[PDB]
Amino acid sequence: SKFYKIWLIFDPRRVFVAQGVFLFLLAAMIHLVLLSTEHFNWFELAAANAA
Amino acid sequence: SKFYKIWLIFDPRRVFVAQGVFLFLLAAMIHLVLLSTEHFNWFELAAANAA
Amino acid sequence: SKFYKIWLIFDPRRVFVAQGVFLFLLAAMIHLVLLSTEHFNWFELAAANAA
Amino acid sequence: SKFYKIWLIFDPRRVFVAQGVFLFLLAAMIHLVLLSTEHFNWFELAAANAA
Amino acid sequence: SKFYKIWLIFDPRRVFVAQGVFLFLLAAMIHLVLLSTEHFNWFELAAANAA
Amino acid sequence: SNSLGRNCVFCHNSRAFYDPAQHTPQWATAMLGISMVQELNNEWIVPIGEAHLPPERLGPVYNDVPKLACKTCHKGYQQPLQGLNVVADWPELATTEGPFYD
Amino acid sequence: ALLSFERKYRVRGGTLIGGDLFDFWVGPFYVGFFGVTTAFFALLGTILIFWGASQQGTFNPWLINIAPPDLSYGLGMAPLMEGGLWQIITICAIGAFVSWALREVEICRKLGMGYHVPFAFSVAIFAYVTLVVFRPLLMGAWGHGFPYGIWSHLDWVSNTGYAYLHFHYNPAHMIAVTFFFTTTLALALHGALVLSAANPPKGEEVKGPDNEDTFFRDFIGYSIGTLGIHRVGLLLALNAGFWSAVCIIISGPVWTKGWPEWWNWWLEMPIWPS
Amino acid sequence: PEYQNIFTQVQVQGPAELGVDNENNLTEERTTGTGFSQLIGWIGNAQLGPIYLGWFGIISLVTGTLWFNIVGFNMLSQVGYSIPEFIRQLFWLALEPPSPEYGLRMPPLDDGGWFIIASFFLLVSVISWWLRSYQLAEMHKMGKHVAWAFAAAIWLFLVLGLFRPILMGSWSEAVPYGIFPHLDWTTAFSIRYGNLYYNPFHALSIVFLYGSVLLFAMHGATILAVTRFGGDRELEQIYDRGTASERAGLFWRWTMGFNATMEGIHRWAWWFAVLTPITGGIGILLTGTVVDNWFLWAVEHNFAPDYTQDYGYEAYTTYDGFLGR
Amino acid sequence: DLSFTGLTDEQAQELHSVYMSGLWLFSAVAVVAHLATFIWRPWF
Amino acid sequence: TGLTDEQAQELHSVYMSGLWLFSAVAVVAHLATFIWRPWF
Amino acid sequence: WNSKNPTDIYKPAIVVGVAGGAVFAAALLVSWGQPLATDSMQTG
Amino acid sequence: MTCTITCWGIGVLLGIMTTVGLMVVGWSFLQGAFMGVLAWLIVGGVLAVAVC
Amino acid sequence: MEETFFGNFDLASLSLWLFYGFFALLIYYLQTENMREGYPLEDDDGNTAANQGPFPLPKEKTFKLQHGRGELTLPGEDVQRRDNLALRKTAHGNGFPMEPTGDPMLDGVGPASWSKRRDVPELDAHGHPKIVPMSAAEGFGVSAGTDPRGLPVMAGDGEIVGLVSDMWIDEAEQLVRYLEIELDPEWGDGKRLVQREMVRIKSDRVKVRSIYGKHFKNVPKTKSPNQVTLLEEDKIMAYYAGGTLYADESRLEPQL
Ligand code: BCL
Ligand code: BCL
Ligand code: BCL
Ligand SMILES: CC[C@H]1c2cc3[nH]c4c(c3C)C(=O)[C@H](C(=O)OC)c4c3nc(cc4[nH]c(cc(n2)[C@@H]1C)c(C(C)=O)c4C)[C@@H](C)[C@@H]3CCC(=O)OC/C=C(\C)CCC[C@H](C)CCC[C@H](C)CCCC(C)C
Ligand SMILES: COC(C)(C)C(=O)/C=C/C(C)=C/C=C/C(C)=C/C=C/C(C)=C/C=C/C=C(C)/C=C/C=C(/C)CC/C=C(/C)CCC=C(C)C
Ligand SMILES: COC(C)(C)C(=O)/C=C/C(C)=C/C=C/C(C)=C/C=C/C(C)=C/C=C/C=C(C)/C=C/C=C(\C)CC/C=C(/C)CCC=C(C)C
Ligand SMILES: COC(C)(C)C(=O)/C=C/C(C)=C/C=C/C(C)=C/C=C/C(C)=C/C=C/C=C(C)/C=C/C=C(\C)CC/C=C(/C)CCC=C(C)C
Ligand SMILES: COC(C)(C)C(=O)/C=C/C(C)=C/C=C/C(C)=C/C=C/C(C)=C/C=C/C=C(C)/C=C/C=C(\C)CC/C=C(\C)CCC=C(C)C
Ligand SMILES: COC(C)(C)C(=O)/C=C/C(C)=C/C=C/C(C)=C/C=C/C(C)=C/C=C/C=C(C)/C=C/C=C(\C)CC/C=C(\C)CCC=C(C)C
Ligand SMILES: COC(C)(C)C(=O)/C=C/C(C)=C/C=C/C(C)=C/C=C/C(C)=C/C=C\C=C(C)\C=C\C=C(\C)CC/C=C(/C)CCC=C(C)C
Ligand SMILES: COC(C)(C)C(=O)/C=C/C(C)=C/C=C/C(C)=C/C=C/C(C)=C\C=C/C=C(C)/C=C/C=C(\C)CC/C=C(\C)CCC=C(C)C
Ligand SMILES: COC(C)(C)C(=O)/C=C/C(C)=C/C=C\C(C)=C/C=C\C(C)=C\C=C\C=C(C)/C=C/C=C(\C)CC/C=C(/C)CCC=C(C)C
Ligand SMILES: [Fe+3]
């Protein structure tokens, strides 16, 4: 298609910085959410399996 | 691939400073996260194994 | 390998001062972290060993 | 070896002043840390040894 | 050795004045630390010696 | 708090003065003290004061019998005489049905 | 991006340390040596708050609470999940605030202007410092600092205020509160003059400094002047920050009784007849 | 070091400035009596210029003195006209509002009757002063921003003593006229209605109170920082932007990513200060009429923090341990 | 020659001898003061 | 704004003369104090 | 001979004294230590 | 100036004397300090105005 | 009323959401009022940037300037823009500092940069020039502080460049604005102005630390000795503040 025309609308430098910040904050948030639960907290599971 | 073109839009001496803060922030944060856990705290594990 | 080019983009005198400060604060921080614990506090261990 | 070239990078009078200040405060700080403890407090040991 | 060249980079006028403040502060600090001690307080030592 | 020498957060939690679930156990003991003071004043102190105290022992405004409150026993401390055991040596004052020295 | 007039001001130099290694701009922001440390400390403190929130069990901004250690731990370090995380964030917070003030020095040095703004911020830092480290040091435990929660740190204020049975009777609180209510009064009146003079009724010429100068002469009989209001306005705000630091550093390290009892010196003066 | 513009290093004094004038004839109500104080001139203007006295100024001053006298003379009568005791207890005496048993009716003079009469004169004095501010701005052909900002303060003043007592149907909800007593009322008001910290408008008003001191420290220091470029002449910088306005804007743009103009700063300054009593006025109005308990409101709306530790001192130490025995 | 203060090579050496003489005299008093203190009240 | 060589000759002569006079009383005072109440 | 060039002679003395005062206060606070200790109990 | 500031210095010096003087004859620090502050403002202010 | 509309949404809750909507509109209004000067954004090369921000430009407002100086609509082309700036980019991209191509203090860039204000004196309410020397002013005199007239002027490196001859005041506000400096023949030729905020007055001298002895001959001069225009004020003040960084390399280079 013609999705490439977005770079005529948005400056590549500012988008790349924008998603670089957004993607990490995305990655940090989901990783933290899993750590908040009991079933998906891999730090507590490792302690649990150690017994 | 042709990922080398990223330096045609990002200046090397403004990105290296960017990841220098980011990389050390990760190294400091993940080390501190492990120290808070009761299982991966290598500082208190030495005390525990010392009986 | 070919990392000598890092000085082509970073001022040698400015980096040396910056990483001299970073190295000392990192060294002091880790020493203080050891002092906070009870196993690796060499000051309290001397008193404990001497009756 | 070849470390004498550091004076081509650092201004000798600026580094000497910083070295002088840093060395004294570092020397002073360590002396108090000994005084803060009870084992390495030469003032109190003389009183204890007097009895 | 060859330490007379320190005056080629340090101004003798400023160094002489600077050390005078440093020496007095050091001397005052050491004396008052002795007062806090129960063994080297020569004022209290005379009272014990007299009685 | 002035009588006990402590402060408001000794018994209460400032964000909820009403909540029974936000009170220290010392709150319950002070609640018993309120009943004790009212009982002592109405039934014990005032009836004997109005019958035997001379005029110079009465109040300046209403000429009323002196009363007791928290500070009469605590004076300025968390416990009277700072928790000193003053009843172990006196079984006579520890009960009203004959002393039990045992 | 730049502004219509920003280009002629972005010159090299003016740094306190690091030279041109960090001397560049990221967007509108200026990055310096202290801009690097600010980014590190602020990001580290922010992430640790949400790490503590994850272990607390809630991500609700109202309910997030990172609390100091118990008073039993004293001035030493505490376990991270038992109050040690609060201590690390405090170090990061202090490092981020001091770096921010030092970054402002570089910015105002590059523009050739005064250092009033970083100095004024230092009073705000001093008020924060005297709440989290200075007062706990005097009282002998790190648990006397306020927790890092949106609504939790109000509960610390409520209990600390009622720990002295009436906190309105604090003489320094009396002075410090007078400075907020006056600074806001000064801010409202100063902002009204410039707005009123620059925005007269429609169809009327704008007014100069003379017109606003004579307005308060007509209104309260005295006008402090265009320069005086900013000069006295900074002093009112700086005194407000300073005296607020005083009212909390004397509550517990200098005064342990109730605050109404302090005024007993005035009530029982020898001059007053009995 | 560099000269920080905190104290003027030299003062010049000339003929007194009697003020501008127009066809409204401002000069015929002016006192035309000026005096110069050098002590205050170290920080601001040294001239104590003439004051415009009209009718709103005179009415407010006379009625304000009547409120001052009625409250003050009642306090003197309370201690039996003992001047030494009046001075000693000056911060403790007051004119207490009416007792709650009288509702909105007129209470006896000794039980809040003089409070209502005194409050009537204070209300007249405050409103008359607002009219003087509104009238002076109109006569000077200036904007009514001073009157509007002062009306925001009166809104909390009216709510705190007039509007809320009517809604509760009792004059007893007013604020006593005392130095320490209105602090006692402030503390008792928060305790009676739960915890006023958890009032969203009290929280919001604190945001604008802190912002007001925040922004005026930021604006006061910025102007003093650019006063070397004639930054204290804010009005001329609006009409013809100089280097002072550019550097002040660029300093904050490089610091926090955005800035203002020499005019727009005073719109931020005006609105934070004005929103301080406007938001608080709404919070006091809702307190007692709607909620009656703010912490329980917070628990219901799920923004009250929960704690899991114990509460007694026995769970953290012992009585002997605290006493060191 | 290298000089950040303006003094010549010979001038600095001449001035250093005066400085060393004062330092040694000041230190000599300190040593005898410390020596008398140690026998009077040792700290070791 | 600076001093000449000649001025320092007189200035130091007075200062040293005053220093010895001040110390002459001090050494006497310390000597008399030790006799009255020694601290050693 | 002498040097007759201007010099900020008192500049290094002031910074040394201020820095020394911090060590001076720290040493006293370690030797004597906390004149008013004001210990507190935790009730919550 | 150089005289108003000097006269102010005499006022604050007197206030310190007034504080310790009243403490000697009894009173208390805060009670003495209040009269010392009051003596600073009055005597110090009068001196700066009576003579310049 | 103590009755909730739905769930737990009472009158107090409704007023909170009304303020949230009002505050969002207030922030939008406040921010757009700050965009009357400096926009559009442009970039380091001078062309308009692709990004302009989330807030659109405000509608035009008109200022009716007094003393017959016409109107002024702030949102629009800026007449204070400078041309032929003596700067060059240090990088091919954006976000990097500019390096002066000549003498920064003479060319007026960075800390020494001025703005193209109107070339007319500021006027008081009557219409006369606002800032005038005390020689022209009638009935004005020094009432407090140290009189600096006649004291020598000492530069940032200790050089004595002349003695203060006159001093310009703001008779509308009775405030001192400038000090005239009678430059010595060895340092300058005529008279120069220094603003009161860059001078520290002592008992025997006045000290200006931002400017060395050799930089005084290049301070911008006034066209007439009786008044100073807004442009001349902006050029004179910028020169002194530009010396706080360009007087010598020690100031420009990092202090640590
Ligand atoms: C839990 C079990 C282990 C543990 C498991 C791991 C694991 C697993 C890993 C680490 C990693 C690391 N650990 Mg660990 N780690 C533990 C305990 C410690 C302790 C300690 C005192 O206890 C320390 C000091 C460290 C420290 C470290 C670093 C060596 C490293 C992280 C690099 C980073 O974050 O910054 C790096 C960021 C930077 C940008 C800093 C650079 C700063 C300098 C000054 C830049 C100078 C550049 C200058 C221009 C010169 C350039 C010259 C070049 C040649 C061009 N760990 C525990 C005991 N640790 C991670 C790692 O990186 O391994 C390589 C890794 O994979
Ligand atoms: C719960 C079970 C697994 C888990 C499940 C998953 C899953 C499932 C996923 C991850 C993913 C990731 N996990 Mg995980 N993860 C767990 C625990 C961890 C732990 C840990 C210590 O325990 C770590 C460190 C990580 C770390 C990560 C990252 C590797 C990655 C997320 C990237 C992102 O968010 O930001 C992205 C960051 C950025 C975009 C910015 C990068 C910044 C750099 C410095 C910018 C440089 C740019 C510069 C111009 C140079 C460019 C050069 C290029 C070559 C052109 N996980 C547990 C153990 N994790 C997600 C992922 O990304 O996979 C690819 C994924 O899908
Ligand atoms: C135990 C105490 C309670 C408390 C109870 C209250 C109460 C009760 C109130 C506030 C309110 C306020 N609180 Mg609260 N508040 C507490 C804790 C705090 C804390 C804190 C750090 O802990 C802070 C900073 C605040 C801050 C504030 C301000 C945001 C706000 C006052 C608005 C204002 O400016 O008034 C300025 C306005 C006036 C002073 C009226 C002006 C009167 C007129 C205009 C002037 C008349 C002049 C008169 C005639 C005299 C003139 C004489 C001249 C000499 C001629 N509160 C605790 C929880 N708070 C107010 C509020 O709610 O606002 C929504 C309020 O009513
Ligand atoms: C909300 C943000 C801030 C604010 C804003 C604000 N206040 C304002 C304004 C604004 C915008 C005005 O324009 C207005 C004003 O005029 O300012 C100069 C004002 C004002 N708010 C004031 C004060 C004030 N502001 C307060 C707070 C605040 N208001 C905040 C800090 C408070 C507090 C803490 O509640 C007070 C008390 C006044 C100074 C002023 C207007 C009040 C006024 O003048 O009322 C008319 C009353 C009189 C003239 C007389 C009053 C009583 C006298 C003491 C009597 C005379 C006694 C004398 C000794 C005679 C004795 C005779 C006998 C011996 C016979
Ligand atoms: C909160 O949640 C929990 C679970 C806790 C959590 O932790 C979540 C974790 C998450 C989200 C992980 C996110 C991490 C990610 C995404 C990893 C990014 C890391 C990357 C990308 C690695 C870059 C390495 C770059 C280097 C190291 C280059 C070295 C450069 C060298 C030095 C060469 C330069 C030298 C030169 C000479 C240049 C040549 C110059 C000329 C030719 C001039
Ligand atoms: C709260 O709710 C819970 C349930 C918890 C939650 O989690 C909610 C989750 C929600 C809402 C999901 C939100 C996530 C979304 C929407 C995902 C967006 C993610 C996207 C879109 C992925 C982009 C990837 C882009 C890259 C990574 C390109 C790589 C770029 C490379 C490096 C090329 C650059 C290289 C060059 C050479 C330059 C270009 C060329 C020239 C210049 C020539
Ligand atoms: C918080 O978590 C816990 C767990 C607590 C934690 O601690 C985690 C800590 C973590 C993760 C830190 C990890 C540290 C890292 C990654 C830092 C690596 C450290 C490095 C890379 C330092 C190299 C320094 C090299 C030197 C020292 C050179 C000296 C150079 C000499 C002096 C030569 C120069 C001399 C010259 C003459 C120049 C020549 C000049 C001419 C030729 C002109
Ligand atoms: C807190 O910790 C506790 C445990 C408490 C603690 O104990 C900490 C103690 C610590 C850390 C000890 C740190 C002490 C150190 C390092 C000792 C430095 C001391 C030194 C180096 C002695 C110099 C003496 C110089 C003189 C006295 C010269 C006399 C010169 C004379 C006067 C000649 C005239 C002068 C000149 C010719 C100079 C040119 C000037 C002109 C020509 C005008
Ligand atoms: C618990 O702590 C304890 C243990 C207590 C403690 O701290 C221990 C104390 C410690 C460690 C301090 C050690 C003290 C030291 C080192 C002080 C040395 C003392 C000195 C140096 C004495 C100077 C005397 C100067 C005079 C009095 C000169 C007289 C000259 C006067 C000024 C007249 C000169 C004027 C003229 C001639 C006129 C001018 C002439 C012309 C214009 C021609
Ligand atoms: C030497 O001189 C003499 C003279 C002898 C003397 O004694 C000196 C006087 C002395 C020392 C008195 C010192 C005064 C003091 C300490 C007073 C402080 C005052 C304080 C803190 C004010 C509290 C806040 C008040 C509010 C918030 C009101 C709000 C209420 C307003 C007004 C609304 C109107 C109310 C109504 C009810 C309407 C009634 C109307 C109708 C019914 C129509
Ligand atoms: C039966 O028992 C008996 C037998 C009775 C018994 O017990 C034995 C008794 C015994 C032994 C008496 C014990 C004596 C004692 C304890 C003596 C203490 C007293 C001492 C030691 C000294 C006093 C005199 C000090 C002066 C008077 C200094 C003069 C200083 C002057 C004022 C100069 C100061 C001013 C300047 C320098 C100005 C400089 C100016 C510039 C710098 C500008
Ligand atoms: C029976 O015997 C018994 C009782 C058992 C016994 O012995 C008991 C004795 C016991 C336990 C010892 C207790 C300590 C004793 C006794 C003394 C120690 C302390 C001593 C000796 C210190 C005095 C110093 C006096 C001056 C006043 C020096 C002046 C020195 C000057 C200051 C040097 C500087 C000179 C310069 C040229 C440099 C100038 C620098 C500048 C200008 C910057
Ligand atoms: Fe302003």
TrEMBL record, chains A, B, C, D, E:
Compartment(s):
Cell inner membrane
Its GO biological process terms?
A: photosynthesis, light reaction
Give the membrane topology.
Answer: Single-pass type II membrane protein
Hydrolase recorded as keyword: no
Q: Which SUPFAM superfamilies match?
A: Light-harvesting complex subunits
Q: Where does bacteriochlorophyll a bind?
A: 27, 31, 42
Q: GO: which molecular function terms?
A: bacteriochlorophyll binding; metal ion binding
Question: What does the UniProt keyword field contain?
Answer: Antenna complex, Bacteriochlorophyll, Cell inner membrane, Cell membrane, Chlorophyll, Chromophore, Light-harvesting polypeptide, Magnesium, Membrane, Metal-binding, Transmembrane, Transmembrane helix
One GO CC term of this entry? organelle inner membrane
InterPro entries named among the record's database cross-references = Antenna_a/b (IPR000066), Antenna_alpha (IPR018332), Antenna_alpha_CS (IPR002361), Light-harvesting_complex (IPR035889)
For this chain, the family text in UniProt reads:
Belongs to the antenna complex alpha subunit family.
Q: What does this protein do?
A: Antenna complexes are light-harvesting systems, which transfer the excitation energy to the reaction centers.
On subunit structure and binding partners, the annotation says: The core complex is formed by different alpha and beta chains, binding bacteriochlorophyll molecules, and arranged most probably in tetrameric structures disposed around the reaction center. The non-pigmented gamma chains may constitute additional components.
Write down what this protein is called.
Answer: Antenna pigment protein alpha chain
Organism from which the protein derives:
Dinoroseobacter shibae (strain DSM 16493 / NCIMB 14021 / DFL 12)
Q: Which gene encodes it?
A: pufA
From TrEMBL, chain F:
Tell me the organism. Answer: Dinoroseobacter shibae (strain DSM 16493 / NCIMB 14021 / DFL 12)
Q: Which UniProt keywords apply?
A: Electron transport, Heme, Iron, Membrane, Metal-binding, Photosynthesis, Reaction center, Transmembrane, Transmembrane helix, Transport
User: Where does this protein hold heme c 1?
Assistant: 57
Q: Name one GO molecular function term.
A: electron transfer activity
Q: Tell me a GO cellular component.
A: plasma membrane light-harvesting complex
Q: Report the record's Gene Ontology biological process terms.
A: photosynthesis, light reaction
Protein known as: Photosynthetic reaction center cytochrome c subunit
User: What does the UniProt PTM comment say about this protein?
Assistant: Binds 4 heme groups per subunit.
Q: Does the keyword Heme apply?
A: yes
Instruction: Name the residues that bind heme c 3.
Output: 8, 12, 27
Question: Which superkingdom, per the lineage?
Answer: Bacteria
Automatic annotation (TrEMBL), chain J:
GO MF terms held by the record: bacteriochlorophyll binding; metal ion binding
This protein's membrane topology, according to the annotation, is: Single-pass type II membrane protein
Report residues binding a bacteriochlorophyll: 12, 30
Keywords associated with the record = Antenna complex, Bacteriochlorophyll, Cell inner membrane, Cell membrane, Chlorophyll, Chromophore, Light-harvesting polypeptide, Magnesium, Membrane, Metal-binding, Transmembrane, Transmembrane helix
Its annotated compartments are:
Cell inner membrane
**What is the purpose of this protein?**
Antenna complexes are light-harvesting systems, which transfer the excitation energy to the reaction centers.
Q: Return the protein name.
A: Antenna pigment protein beta chain
Organism of provenance = Dinoroseobacter shibae (strain DSM 16493 / NCIMB 14021 / DFL 12)
Q: Which residues of the full protein are shown?
A: 10 to 49 of 49
From TrEMBL, chain M:
Claim: Thylakoid is one of the keywords in the record? no
Pfam family for this entry, one = PRC
Query: Photosynthetic reaction centre H subunit N-terminal domain: from which residue to which, for each copy?
Result: 4-135
**What InterPro entries does this protein's entry cite?**
Bac_photo_RC_H_C, Photo_RC_H, Photo_RC_H_N, Photo_RC_H_N_sf, PRC-brl_dom, PRC_barrel-like_sf
Question: What is one GO biological process annotated to this record?
Answer: photosynthesis, light reaction
Ranges where the PRC-barrel domain occurs: 142-213
Its transmembrane ranges are 12-30
- Cellular component aspect of the GO annotation: plasma membrane light-harvesting complex
Keyword entries, A-Z: Membrane, Transmembrane, Transmembrane helix
By what name is this protein known? Reaction center protein H chain
Q: Which gene encodes it?
A: puhA
